[PDB]
Amino acid sequence: KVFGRCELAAAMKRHGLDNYRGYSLGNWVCAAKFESNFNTQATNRNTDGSTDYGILQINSRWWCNDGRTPGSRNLCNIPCSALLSSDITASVNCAKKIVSDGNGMNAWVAWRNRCKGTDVQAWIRGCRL
Ligand SMILES: [Cl-]
Ligand SMILES: [Cl-]
Ligand code: NA
């Protein structure tokens, strides 16, 4: 599924991401825009043989099991394919674990390089929340 901007903002707010660990909603919407262009089915093969999955491009090296990243962890205890669903629950629940692990949203390279330090509230302007 390819989300609209305000559609995704409302879904993320319902799932408790607004101000989660101090990150306002616009941060999460900005991260999803540049990680996946709002597409739940996005996948990208990393260098090291791991793969990033879903709307927030969660990495199989640490966070999910895809059966083809030897020596990796599965800290969210999920198959990586669950992160491609039109229902974003699994992605949100795993993202909450990632952002809590000490490095905040710097875990997402596109957030660090394209959202951090910008007016991220622009990403939820005009939406019904
Ligand atoms: Cl915001
Ligand atoms: Cl933080
Ligand atoms: Na894994």
PDB file of N, CA and C in Angstrom, residues 31-83:
ATOM      1  N   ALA A  31      10.580  10.690   8.105  1.00  0.00           N
ATOM      2  CA  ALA A  31      11.422   9.506   7.957  1.00  0.00           C
ATOM      3  C   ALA A  31      10.805   8.521   6.971  1.00  0.00           C
ATOM      4  N   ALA A  32       9.495   8.296   7.063  1.00  0.00           N
ATOM      5  CA  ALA A  32       8.866   7.344   6.152  1.00  0.00           C
ATOM      6  C   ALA A  32       8.894   7.847   4.713  1.00  0.00           C
ATOM      7  N   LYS A  33       8.726   9.152   4.507  1.00  0.00           N
ATOM      8  CA  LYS A  33       8.765   9.693   3.152  1.00  0.00           C
ATOM      9  C   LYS A  33      10.100   9.403   2.484  1.00  0.00           C
ATOM     10  N   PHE A  34      11.195   9.654   3.181  1.00  0.00           N
ATOM     11  CA  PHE A  34      12.485   9.491   2.528  1.00  0.00           C
ATOM     12  C   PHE A  34      13.028   8.072   2.628  1.00  0.00           C
ATOM     13  N   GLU A  35      12.538   7.259   3.568  1.00  0.00           N
ATOM     14  CA  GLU A  35      12.989   5.866   3.592  1.00  0.00           C
ATOM     15  C   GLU A  35      12.297   5.024   2.523  1.00  0.00           C
ATOM     16  N   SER A  36      10.993   5.238   2.300  1.00  0.00           N
ATOM     17  CA  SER A  36      10.215   4.323   1.470  1.00  0.00           C
ATOM     18  C   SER A  36       9.249   4.999   0.506  1.00  0.00           C
ATOM     19  N   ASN A  37       9.197   6.336   0.466  1.00  0.00           N
ATOM     20  CA  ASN A  37       8.191   7.078  -0.313  1.00  0.00           C
ATOM     21  C   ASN A  37       6.775   6.635   0.054  1.00  0.00           C
ATOM     22  N   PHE A  38       6.577   6.303   1.330  1.00  0.00           N
ATOM     23  CA  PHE A  38       5.284   5.941   1.911  1.00  0.00           C
ATOM     24  C   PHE A  38       4.756   4.595   1.412  1.00  0.00           C
ATOM     25  N   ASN A  39       5.629   3.728   0.889  1.00  0.00           N
ATOM     26  CA  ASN A  39       5.240   2.443   0.300  1.00  0.00           C
ATOM     27  C   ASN A  39       5.553   1.313   1.275  1.00  0.00           C
ATOM     28  N   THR A  40       4.514   0.600   1.732  1.00  0.00           N
ATOM     29  CA  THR A  40       4.748  -0.484   2.676  1.00  0.00           C
ATOM     30  C   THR A  40       5.533  -1.635   2.052  1.00  0.00           C
ATOM     31  N   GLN A  41       5.571  -1.749   0.722  1.00  0.00           N
ATOM     32  CA  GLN A  41       6.218  -2.902   0.102  1.00  0.00           C
ATOM     33  C   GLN A  41       7.668  -2.643  -0.276  1.00  0.00           C
ATOM     34  N   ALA A  42       8.228  -1.488   0.093  1.00  0.00           N
ATOM     35  CA  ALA A  42       9.606  -1.171  -0.265  1.00  0.00           C
ATOM     36  C   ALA A  42      10.602  -2.143   0.370  1.00  0.00           C
ATOM     37  N   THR A  43      11.560  -2.602  -0.434  1.00  0.00           N
ATOM     38  CA  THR A  43      12.687  -3.398   0.041  1.00  0.00           C
ATOM     39  C   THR A  43      13.949  -2.876  -0.617  1.00  0.00           C
ATOM     40  N   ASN A  44      15.059  -2.973   0.104  1.00  0.00           N
ATOM     41  CA  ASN A  44      16.335  -2.547  -0.460  1.00  0.00           C
ATOM     42  C   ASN A  44      17.432  -3.405   0.138  1.00  0.00           C
ATOM     43  N   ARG A  45      18.284  -3.959  -0.722  1.00  0.00           N
ATOM     44  CA  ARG A  45      19.345  -4.840  -0.268  1.00  0.00           C
ATOM     45  C   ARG A  45      20.517  -3.995   0.178  1.00  0.00           C
ATOM     46  N   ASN A  46      20.936  -4.208   1.415  1.00  0.00           N
ATOM     47  CA  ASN A  46      22.080  -3.464   1.864  1.00  0.00           C
ATOM     48  C   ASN A  46      23.302  -4.073   1.240  1.00  0.00           C
ATOM     49  N   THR A  47      24.405  -3.361   1.352  1.00  0.00           N
ATOM     50  CA  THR A  47      25.698  -3.950   1.083  1.00  0.00           C
ATOM     51  C   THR A  47      25.825  -5.327   1.707  1.00  0.00           C
ATOM     52  N   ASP A  48      25.954  -5.381   3.021  1.00  0.00           N
ATOM     53  CA  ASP A  48      26.323  -6.606   3.735  1.00  0.00           C
ATOM     54  C   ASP A  48      25.414  -7.837   3.598  1.00  0.00           C
ATOM     55  N   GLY A  49      24.537  -7.906   2.605  1.00  0.00           N
ATOM     56  CA  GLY A  49      23.664  -9.052   2.469  1.00  0.00           C
ATOM     57  C   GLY A  49      22.383  -8.964   3.263  1.00  0.00           C
ATOM     58  N   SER A  50      22.296  -8.057   4.240  1.00  0.00           N
ATOM     59  CA  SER A  50      21.030  -7.778   4.903  1.00  0.00           C
ATOM     60  C   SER A  50      20.120  -6.980   3.968  1.00  0.00           C
ATOM     61  N   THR A  51      18.848  -6.902   4.338  1.00  0.00           N
ATOM     62  CA  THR A  51      17.831  -6.215   3.551  1.00  0.00           C
ATOM     63  C   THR A  51      17.013  -5.325   4.483  1.00  0.00           C
ATOM     64  N   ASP A  52      16.595  -4.155   3.984  1.00  0.00           N
ATOM     65  CA  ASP A  52      15.687  -3.252   4.693  1.00  0.00           C
ATOM     66  C   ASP A  52      14.259  -3.438   4.183  1.00  0.00           C
ATOM     67  N   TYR A  53      13.288  -3.434   5.103  1.00  0.00           N
ATOM     68  CA  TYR A  53      11.903  -3.795   4.793  1.00  0.00           C
ATOM     69  C   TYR A  53      10.911  -2.735   5.241  1.00  0.00           C
ATOM     70  N   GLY A  54      10.016  -2.359   4.330  1.00  0.00           N
ATOM     71  CA  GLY A  54       8.792  -1.692   4.719  1.00  0.00           C
ATOM     72  C   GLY A  54       8.910  -0.187   4.766  1.00  0.00           C
ATOM     73  N   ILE A  55       7.864   0.400   5.348  1.00  0.00           N
ATOM     74  CA  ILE A  55       7.679   1.844   5.296  1.00  0.00           C
ATOM     75  C   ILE A  55       8.787   2.578   6.050  1.00  0.00           C
ATOM     76  N   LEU A  56       9.395   1.936   7.056  1.00  0.00           N
ATOM     77  CA  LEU A  56      10.509   2.505   7.804  1.00  0.00           C
ATOM     78  C   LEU A  56      11.813   1.747   7.577  1.00  0.00           C
ATOM     79  N   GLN A  57      11.867   0.878   6.571  1.00  0.00           N
ATOM     80  CA  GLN A  57      13.121   0.274   6.111  1.00  0.00           C
ATOM     81  C   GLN A  57      13.920  -0.338   7.266  1.00  0.00           C
ATOM     82  N   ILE A  58      13.261  -1.242   7.975  1.00  0.00           N
ATOM     83  CA  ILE A  58      13.855  -1.902   9.136  1.00  0.00           C
ATOM     84  C   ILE A  58      14.767  -3.034   8.662  1.00  0.00           C
ATOM     85  N   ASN A  59      15.975  -3.106   9.248  1.00  0.00           N
ATOM     86  CA  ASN A  59      17.094  -3.912   8.750  1.00  0.00           C
ATOM     87  C   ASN A  59      17.083  -5.320   9.348  1.00  0.00           C
ATOM     88  N   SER A  60      17.235  -6.334   8.484  1.00  0.00           N
ATOM     89  CA  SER A  60      17.258  -7.725   8.931  1.00  0.00           C
ATOM     90  C   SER A  60      18.536  -8.103   9.658  1.00  0.00           C
ATOM     91  N   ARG A  61      19.573  -7.257   9.626  1.00  0.00           N
ATOM     92  CA  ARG A  61      20.784  -7.565  10.381  1.00  0.00           C
ATOM     93  C   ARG A  61      20.492  -7.662  11.872  1.00  0.00           C
ATOM     94  N   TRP A  62      19.503  -6.913  12.363  1.00  0.00           N
ATOM     95  CA  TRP A  62      19.259  -6.872  13.798  1.00  0.00           C
ATOM     96  C   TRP A  62      17.823  -7.162  14.206  1.00  0.00           C
ATOM     97  N   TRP A  63      16.841  -6.845  13.355  1.00  0.00           N
ATOM     98  CA  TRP A  63      15.492  -6.599  13.849  1.00  0.00           C
ATOM     99  C   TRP A  63      14.439  -7.594  13.399  1.00  0.00           C
ATOM    100  N   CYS A  64      14.646  -8.312  12.297  1.00  0.00           N
ATOM    101  CA  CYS A  64      13.659  -9.279  11.841  1.00  0.00           C
ATOM    102  C   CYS A  64      14.376 -10.437  11.161  1.00  0.00           C
ATOM    103  N   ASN A  65      13.644 -11.530  10.976  1.00  0.00           N
ATOM    104  CA  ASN A  65      14.199 -12.724  10.345  1.00  0.00           C
ATOM    105  C   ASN A  65      13.692 -12.858   8.915  1.00  0.00           C
ATOM    106  N   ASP A  66      14.622 -12.906   7.955  1.00  0.00           N
ATOM    107  CA  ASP A  66      14.267 -13.158   6.558  1.00  0.00           C
ATOM    108  C   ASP A  66      14.900 -14.437   6.017  1.00  0.00           C
ATOM    109  N   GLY A  67      15.572 -15.216   6.865  1.00  0.00           N
ATOM    110  CA  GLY A  67      16.091 -16.513   6.464  1.00  0.00           C
ATOM    111  C   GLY A  67      17.309 -16.475   5.580  1.00  0.00           C
ATOM    112  N   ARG A  68      17.857 -15.290   5.309  1.00  0.00           N
ATOM    113  CA  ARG A  68      18.988 -15.195   4.397  1.00  0.00           C
ATOM    114  C   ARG A  68      20.001 -14.145   4.838  1.00  0.00           C
ATOM    115  N   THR A  69      20.072 -13.837   6.134  1.00  0.00           N
ATOM    116  CA  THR A  69      21.072 -12.928   6.689  1.00  0.00           C
ATOM    117  C   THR A  69      21.827 -13.698   7.778  1.00  0.00           C
ATOM    118  N   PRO A  70      22.788 -14.543   7.396  1.00  0.00           N
ATOM    119  CA  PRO A  70      23.432 -15.416   8.393  1.00  0.00           C
ATOM    120  C   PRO A  70      24.123 -14.628   9.494  1.00  0.00           C
ATOM    121  N   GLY A  71      24.002 -15.135  10.719  1.00  0.00           N
ATOM    122  CA  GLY A  71      24.606 -14.487  11.865  1.00  0.00           C
ATOM    123  C   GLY A  71      23.876 -13.262  12.360  1.00  0.00           C
ATOM    124  N   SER A  72      22.649 -13.037  11.903  1.00  0.00           N
ATOM    125  CA  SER A  72      21.904 -11.850  12.285  1.00  0.00           C
ATOM    126  C   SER A  72      21.016 -12.122  13.500  1.00  0.00           C
ATOM    127  N   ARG A  73      20.486 -11.041  14.061  1.00  0.00           N
ATOM    128  CA  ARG A  73      19.534 -11.105  15.155  1.00  0.00           C
ATOM    129  C   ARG A  73      18.122 -10.841  14.640  1.00  0.00           C
ATOM    130  N   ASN A  74      17.147 -11.100  15.510  1.00  0.00           N
ATOM    131  CA  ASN A  74      15.727 -10.925  15.241  1.00  0.00           C
ATOM    132  C   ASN A  74      15.125 -10.295  16.500  1.00  0.00           C
ATOM    133  N   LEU A  75      15.523  -9.051  16.788  1.00  0.00           N
ATOM    134  CA  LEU A  75      15.187  -8.443  18.074  1.00  0.00           C
ATOM    135  C   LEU A  75      13.719  -8.060  18.175  1.00  0.00           C
ATOM    136  N   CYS A  76      13.038  -7.855  17.053  1.00  0.00           N
ATOM    137  CA  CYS A  76      11.608  -7.595  17.097  1.00  0.00           C
ATOM    138  C   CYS A  76      10.779  -8.869  17.051  1.00  0.00           C
ATOM    139  N   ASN A  77      11.427 -10.031  16.898  1.00  0.00           N
ATOM    140  CA  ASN A  77      10.771 -11.341  16.957  1.00  0.00           C
ATOM    141  C   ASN A  77       9.655 -11.456  15.919  1.00  0.00           C
ATOM    142  N   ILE A  78       9.992 -11.142  14.670  1.00  0.00           N
ATOM    143  CA  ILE A  78       9.016 -11.172  13.582  1.00  0.00           C
ATOM    144  C   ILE A  78       9.684 -11.588  12.283  1.00  0.00           C
ATOM    145  N   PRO A  79       8.976 -12.256  11.377  1.00  0.00           N
ATOM    146  CA  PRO A  79       9.478 -12.380  10.007  1.00  0.00           C
ATOM    147  C   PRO A  79       9.493 -11.008   9.344  1.00  0.00           C
ATOM    148  N   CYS A  80      10.543 -10.742   8.561  1.00  0.00           N
ATOM    149  CA  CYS A  80      10.639  -9.446   7.886  1.00  0.00           C
ATOM    150  C   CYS A  80       9.445  -9.178   6.971  1.00  0.00           C
ATOM    151  N   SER A  81       8.828 -10.230   6.422  1.00  0.00           N
ATOM    152  CA  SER A  81       7.676 -10.040   5.540  1.00  0.00           C
ATOM    153  C   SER A  81       6.498  -9.379   6.253  1.00  0.00           C
ATOM    154  N   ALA A  82       6.391  -9.549   7.571  1.00  0.00           N
ATOM    155  CA  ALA A  82       5.336  -8.866   8.315  1.00  0.00           C
ATOM    156  C   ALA A  82       5.465  -7.354   8.237  1.00  0.00           C
ATOM    157  N   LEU A  83       6.662  -6.846   7.963  1.00  0.00           N
ATOM    158  CA  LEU A  83       6.887  -5.411   7.829  1.00  0.00           C
ATOM    159  C   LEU A  83       6.434  -4.845   6.491  1.00  0.00           C
TER     160      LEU A  83
END
